[PDB]
Amino acid sequence: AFARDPTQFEERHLKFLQQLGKGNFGSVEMCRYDPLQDGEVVAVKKLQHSTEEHLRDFEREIEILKSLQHDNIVKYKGVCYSAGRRNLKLIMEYLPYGSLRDYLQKHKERIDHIKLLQYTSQICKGMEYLGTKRYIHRDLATRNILVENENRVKIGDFGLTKVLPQDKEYYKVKEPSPIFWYAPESLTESKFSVASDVWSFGVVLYELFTYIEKSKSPPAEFMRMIGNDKQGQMIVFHLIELLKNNGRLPRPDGCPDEIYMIMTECWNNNVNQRPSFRDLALRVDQIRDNM
Ligand SMILES: CCS(=O)(=O)N1CC(CC#N)(n2cc(-c3nc(Nc4cc(F)c(C5=CCN(C)CC5)c(F)c4)nc4[nH]ccc34)cn2)C1
């Protein structure tokens, strides 16, 4: 059966305006839905280089997003069953300021530490909410956070999100990767969990405090530590060895020690010792409130 109402967004009234994002397997476009043919601007996600397995994953992704209703999660609006109801596209609210990764670079001169901590708090709260559904995001990064306005960000994409098995606290991926955001046990055992999302959240917090400055990204810093000339699997082997023996991204320029300490606590090789998203949201909000 049709998991969504197929009459809500009819393809003949969904008009393309602009490309917003693009990867190897998906893209997001700005469109306008004008049923009166005379409408609302929306964001539309579609597959690229689609396959039956990717379409099945996309259906799971759509079901994930439709199940989430939270101030710091982008709003699902519906599905368009295009190509004569032989294809799927996901309809979402359009967030006018784009990805946080780009916004931070464009507006770094107006964004101070307390503003970065507001962004940190909101991402944390979206992640607390995901955990209540037993969803593991698996792709937390500033490129996947969107800006609604100067005071509100939202987690914007769920293309890699998985639901935990009923009887397990981790999801084991078979055939796989943003390796420079991955927790060590994801690299060495293919295991993803709430705690590996907390590791990746530490990387997001690092990204925020770098302001996405050139040469400070996690890939650039890890490659500088590993050796820039290395290629292929040797990179992974060195990253594993580096993380297991306490190699870490550096404290960003200007970053307070207290905030670097939060990053370092998220980057614990002991999975059970990492803080929870609830711990993190309270700690960050108390820092903001005490400033
Ligand atoms: C890699 C596979 S993917 O392509 O599928 N993937 C990439 C992906 C990453 C995430 N999350 N994404 C999602 C969106 C997206 N953007 C928007 N608004 C938007 C507004 C803007 F003003 C701009 C600008 C364009 C020109 N600039 C110079 C300035 C800012 C913009 F870029 C986006 N609203 C949305 N609602 C739901 C999704 C969504 C965008 N990228 C999901």
Side-chain angles (χ1 to χ4, degrees), residues 181-205:
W181 279 251
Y182 274 2
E185 74 275 6
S186 305
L187 295 165
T188 62
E189 316 171 349
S190 307
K191 287 183 164 184
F192 295 83
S193 60
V194 171
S196 64
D197 284 337
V198 166
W199 177 288
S200 299
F201 171 82
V203 188
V204 173
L205 182 55

mmCIF file of all heavy atoms in Angstrom, residues 181-205:
data_model
loop_
_atom_site.group_PDB
_atom_site.id
_atom_site.type_symbol
_atom_site.label_atom_id
_atom_site.label_comp_id
_atom_site.label_asym_id
_atom_site.label_seq_id
_atom_site.Cartn_x
_atom_site.Cartn_y
_atom_site.Cartn_z
ATOM 1 N N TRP A 181 34.638 10.972 11.052
ATOM 2 C CA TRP A 181 33.673 11.224 12.110
ATOM 3 C C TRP A 181 33.348 9.963 12.898
ATOM 4 O O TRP A 181 32.606 10.033 13.882
ATOM 5 C CB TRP A 181 32.363 11.808 11.522
ATOM 6 C CG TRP A 181 32.401 13.320 11.239
ATOM 7 C CD1 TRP A 181 31.735 14.289 11.935
ATOM 8 C CD2 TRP A 181 33.082 13.987 10.157
ATOM 9 N NE1 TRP A 181 31.956 15.506 11.344
ATOM 10 C CE2 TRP A 181 32.786 15.363 10.278
ATOM 11 C CE3 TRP A 181 33.898 13.556 9.091
ATOM 12 C CZ2 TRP A 181 33.269 16.322 9.402
ATOM 13 C CZ3 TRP A 181 34.364 14.502 8.190
ATOM 14 C CH2 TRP A 181 34.058 15.897 8.379
ATOM 15 N N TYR A 182 33.894 8.814 12.493
ATOM 16 C CA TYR A 182 33.502 7.549 13.084
ATOM 17 C C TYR A 182 34.192 7.248 14.398
ATOM 18 O O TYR A 182 35.406 7.485 14.578
ATOM 19 C CB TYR A 182 33.881 6.389 12.158
ATOM 20 C CG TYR A 182 32.910 6.036 11.094
ATOM 21 C CD1 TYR A 182 31.736 6.763 10.929
ATOM 22 C CD2 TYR A 182 33.087 4.884 10.369
ATOM 23 C CE1 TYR A 182 30.808 6.384 9.965
ATOM 24 C CE2 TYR A 182 32.154 4.486 9.417
ATOM 25 C CZ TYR A 182 31.032 5.262 9.224
ATOM 26 O OH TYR A 182 30.073 4.872 8.307
ATOM 27 N N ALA A 183 33.424 6.652 15.293
ATOM 28 C CA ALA A 183 33.988 6.109 16.506
ATOM 29 C C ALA A 183 34.896 4.913 16.196
ATOM 30 O O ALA A 183 34.718 4.201 15.187
ATOM 31 C CB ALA A 183 32.842 5.660 17.430
ATOM 32 N N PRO A 184 35.871 4.653 17.050
ATOM 33 C CA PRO A 184 36.809 3.554 16.773
ATOM 34 C C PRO A 184 36.135 2.206 16.590
ATOM 35 O O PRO A 184 36.521 1.456 15.690
ATOM 36 C CB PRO A 184 37.746 3.565 17.990
ATOM 37 C CG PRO A 184 37.494 4.838 18.697
ATOM 38 C CD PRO A 184 36.201 5.417 18.276
ATOM 39 N N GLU A 185 35.118 1.870 17.388
ATOM 40 C CA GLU A 185 34.451 0.584 17.245
ATOM 41 C C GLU A 185 33.606 0.508 15.992
ATOM 42 O O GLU A 185 33.304 -0.599 15.527
ATOM 43 C CB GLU A 185 33.617 0.257 18.486
ATOM 44 C CG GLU A 185 32.342 1.081 18.582
ATOM 45 C CD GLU A 185 32.527 2.478 19.247
ATOM 46 O OE1 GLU A 185 33.679 2.906 19.554
ATOM 47 O OE2 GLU A 185 31.450 3.138 19.463
ATOM 48 N N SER A 186 33.236 1.645 15.409
ATOM 49 C CA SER A 186 32.610 1.612 14.087
ATOM 50 C C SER A 186 33.639 1.261 13.025
ATOM 51 O O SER A 186 33.354 0.475 12.113
ATOM 52 C CB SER A 186 31.965 2.956 13.751
ATOM 53 O OG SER A 186 31.038 3.362 14.773
ATOM 54 N N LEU A 187 34.861 1.789 13.161
ATOM 55 C CA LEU A 187 35.941 1.439 12.228
ATOM 56 C C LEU A 187 36.367 -0.019 12.373
ATOM 57 O O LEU A 187 36.653 -0.689 11.363
ATOM 58 C CB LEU A 187 37.155 2.363 12.450
ATOM 59 C CG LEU A 187 36.920 3.848 12.121
ATOM 60 C CD1 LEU A 187 38.072 4.698 12.734
ATOM 61 C CD2 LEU A 187 36.821 4.100 10.605
ATOM 62 N N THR A 188 36.482 -0.518 13.603
ATOM 63 C CA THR A 188 37.080 -1.832 13.828
ATOM 64 C C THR A 188 36.075 -2.977 13.917
ATOM 65 O O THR A 188 36.462 -4.130 13.716
ATOM 66 C CB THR A 188 37.910 -1.858 15.120
ATOM 67 O OG1 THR A 188 37.063 -1.591 16.249
ATOM 68 C CG2 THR A 188 39.009 -0.802 15.068
ATOM 69 N N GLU A 189 34.798 -2.695 14.246
ATOM 70 C CA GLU A 189 33.779 -3.728 14.405
ATOM 71 C C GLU A 189 32.501 -3.455 13.634
ATOM 72 O O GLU A 189 31.570 -4.274 13.722
ATOM 73 C CB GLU A 189 33.454 -4.003 15.886
ATOM 74 C CG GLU A 189 34.682 -4.108 16.811
ATOM 75 C CD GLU A 189 34.370 -4.155 18.321
ATOM 76 O OE1 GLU A 189 33.222 -3.900 18.727
ATOM 77 O OE2 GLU A 189 35.298 -4.435 19.117
ATOM 78 N N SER A 190 32.434 -2.343 12.890
ATOM 79 C CA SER A 190 31.242 -1.953 12.127
ATOM 80 C C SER A 190 30.028 -1.722 13.027
ATOM 81 O O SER A 190 28.887 -1.877 12.581
ATOM 82 C CB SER A 190 30.912 -2.949 11.010
ATOM 83 O OG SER A 190 32.046 -3.152 10.188
ATOM 84 N N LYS A 191 30.254 -1.371 14.292
ATOM 85 C CA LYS A 191 29.174 -1.241 15.277
ATOM 86 C C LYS A 191 28.794 0.219 15.439
ATOM 87 O O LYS A 191 29.650 1.059 15.708
ATOM 88 C CB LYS A 191 29.607 -1.806 16.635
ATOM 89 C CG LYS A 191 29.681 -3.331 16.676
ATOM 90 C CD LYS A 191 30.053 -3.821 18.079
ATOM 91 C CE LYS A 191 29.750 -5.307 18.216
ATOM 92 N NZ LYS A 191 30.008 -5.824 19.595
ATOM 93 N N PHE A 192 27.500 0.507 15.320
ATOM 94 C CA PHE A 192 26.934 1.844 15.473
ATOM 95 C C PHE A 192 25.901 1.823 16.589
ATOM 96 O O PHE A 192 25.105 0.883 16.706
ATOM 97 C CB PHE A 192 26.315 2.332 14.130
ATOM 98 C CG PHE A 192 27.344 2.499 13.054
ATOM 99 C CD1 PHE A 192 27.749 1.403 12.324
ATOM 100 C CD2 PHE A 192 27.958 3.725 12.853
ATOM 101 C CE1 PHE A 192 28.749 1.531 11.373
ATOM 102 C CE2 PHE A 192 28.945 3.869 11.866
ATOM 103 C CZ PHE A 192 29.327 2.749 11.137
ATOM 104 N N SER A 193 25.917 2.878 17.392
ATOM 105 C CA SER A 193 25.079 2.917 18.588
ATOM 106 C C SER A 193 24.816 4.362 18.953
ATOM 107 O O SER A 193 25.384 5.273 18.365
ATOM 108 C CB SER A 193 25.825 2.240 19.741
ATOM 109 O OG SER A 193 27.070 2.933 20.006
ATOM 110 N N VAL A 194 23.975 4.571 19.976
ATOM 111 C CA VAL A 194 23.859 5.922 20.505
ATOM 112 C C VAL A 194 25.242 6.476 20.881
ATOM 113 O O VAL A 194 25.558 7.645 20.610
ATOM 114 C CB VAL A 194 22.852 5.941 21.677
ATOM 115 C CG1 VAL A 194 22.897 7.294 22.387
ATOM 116 C CG2 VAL A 194 21.414 5.632 21.174
ATOM 117 N N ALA A 195 26.072 5.655 21.518
ATOM 118 C CA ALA A 195 27.390 6.102 21.936
ATOM 119 C C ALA A 195 28.304 6.434 20.769
ATOM 120 O O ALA A 195 29.164 7.303 20.896
ATOM 121 C CB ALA A 195 28.029 5.050 22.839
ATOM 122 N N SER A 196 28.154 5.757 19.627
ATOM 123 C CA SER A 196 28.947 6.213 18.476
ATOM 124 C C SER A 196 28.410 7.517 17.913
ATOM 125 O O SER A 196 29.186 8.347 17.457
ATOM 126 C CB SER A 196 29.135 5.141 17.385
ATOM 127 O OG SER A 196 27.922 4.764 16.789
ATOM 128 N N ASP A 197 27.090 7.777 18.037
ATOM 129 C CA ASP A 197 26.598 9.108 17.692
ATOM 130 C C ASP A 197 27.173 10.166 18.632
ATOM 131 O O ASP A 197 27.449 11.279 18.193
ATOM 132 C CB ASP A 197 25.055 9.207 17.709
ATOM 133 C CG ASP A 197 24.362 8.564 16.488
ATOM 134 O OD1 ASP A 197 24.983 8.410 15.388
ATOM 135 O OD2 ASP A 197 23.143 8.321 16.586
ATOM 136 N N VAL A 198 27.369 9.826 19.909
ATOM 137 C CA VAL A 198 27.996 10.779 20.834
ATOM 138 C C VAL A 198 29.438 11.083 20.426
ATOM 139 O O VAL A 198 29.857 12.255 20.418
ATOM 140 C CB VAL A 198 27.898 10.287 22.288
ATOM 141 C CG1 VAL A 198 28.838 11.081 23.244
ATOM 142 C CG2 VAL A 198 26.429 10.391 22.763
ATOM 143 N N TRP A 199 30.208 10.045 20.028
ATOM 144 C CA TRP A 199 31.541 10.308 19.479
ATOM 145 C C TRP A 199 31.461 11.304 18.319
ATOM 146 O O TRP A 199 32.204 12.291 18.255
ATOM 147 C CB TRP A 199 32.149 8.973 18.997
ATOM 148 C CG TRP A 199 33.496 9.145 18.344
ATOM 149 C CD1 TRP A 199 33.721 9.694 17.124
ATOM 150 C CD2 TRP A 199 34.783 8.829 18.904
ATOM 151 N NE1 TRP A 199 35.100 9.739 16.870
ATOM 152 C CE2 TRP A 199 35.755 9.213 17.948
ATOM 153 C CE3 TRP A 199 35.204 8.255 20.103
ATOM 154 C CZ2 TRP A 199 37.120 9.043 18.161
ATOM 155 C CZ3 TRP A 199 36.595 8.061 20.305
ATOM 156 C CH2 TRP A 199 37.510 8.458 19.333
ATOM 157 N N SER A 200 30.574 11.017 17.355
ATOM 158 C CA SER A 200 30.469 11.898 16.196
ATOM 159 C C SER A 200 30.007 13.289 16.599
ATOM 160 O O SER A 200 30.447 14.276 16.000
ATOM 161 C CB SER A 200 29.537 11.308 15.152
ATOM 162 O OG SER A 200 30.060 10.067 14.721
ATOM 163 N N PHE A 201 29.134 13.399 17.597
ATOM 164 C CA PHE A 201 28.753 14.706 18.125
ATOM 165 C C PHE A 201 29.970 15.483 18.615
ATOM 166 O O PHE A 201 30.054 16.703 18.397
ATOM 167 C CB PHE A 201 27.712 14.528 19.233
ATOM 168 C CG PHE A 201 27.438 15.798 19.969
ATOM 169 C CD1 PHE A 201 26.565 16.725 19.435
ATOM 170 C CD2 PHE A 201 28.116 16.083 21.119
ATOM 171 C CE1 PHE A 201 26.332 17.940 20.108
ATOM 172 C CE2 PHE A 201 27.935 17.300 21.781
ATOM 173 C CZ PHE A 201 27.052 18.209 21.259
ATOM 174 N N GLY A 202 30.927 14.798 19.256
ATOM 175 C CA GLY A 202 32.161 15.466 19.631
ATOM 176 C C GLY A 202 32.870 16.070 18.427
ATOM 177 O O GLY A 202 33.458 17.165 18.515
ATOM 178 N N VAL A 203 32.856 15.337 17.304
ATOM 179 C CA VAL A 203 33.446 15.863 16.082
ATOM 180 C C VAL A 203 32.657 17.066 15.583
ATOM 181 O O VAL A 203 33.255 18.041 15.094
ATOM 182 C CB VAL A 203 33.608 14.788 14.987
ATOM 183 C CG1 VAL A 203 34.406 15.372 13.821
ATOM 184 C CG2 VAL A 203 34.384 13.623 15.543
ATOM 185 N N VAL A 204 31.311 17.019 15.659
ATOM 186 C CA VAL A 204 30.521 18.188 15.275
ATOM 187 C C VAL A 204 30.898 19.399 16.137
ATOM 188 O O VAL A 204 31.014 20.522 15.632
ATOM 189 C CB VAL A 204 29.026 17.874 15.395
ATOM 190 C CG1 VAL A 204 28.188 19.107 15.179
ATOM 191 C CG2 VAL A 204 28.607 16.804 14.387
ATOM 192 N N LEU A 205 31.063 19.184 17.458
ATOM 193 C CA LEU A 205 31.428 20.275 18.364
ATOM 194 C C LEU A 205 32.794 20.850 17.970
ATOM 195 O O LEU A 205 32.958 22.082 17.909
ATOM 196 C CB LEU A 205 31.415 19.750 19.803
ATOM 197 C CG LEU A 205 31.719 20.760 20.904
ATOM 198 C CD1 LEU A 205 30.779 22.015 20.864
ATOM 199 C CD2 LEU A 205 31.589 20.051 22.251
#
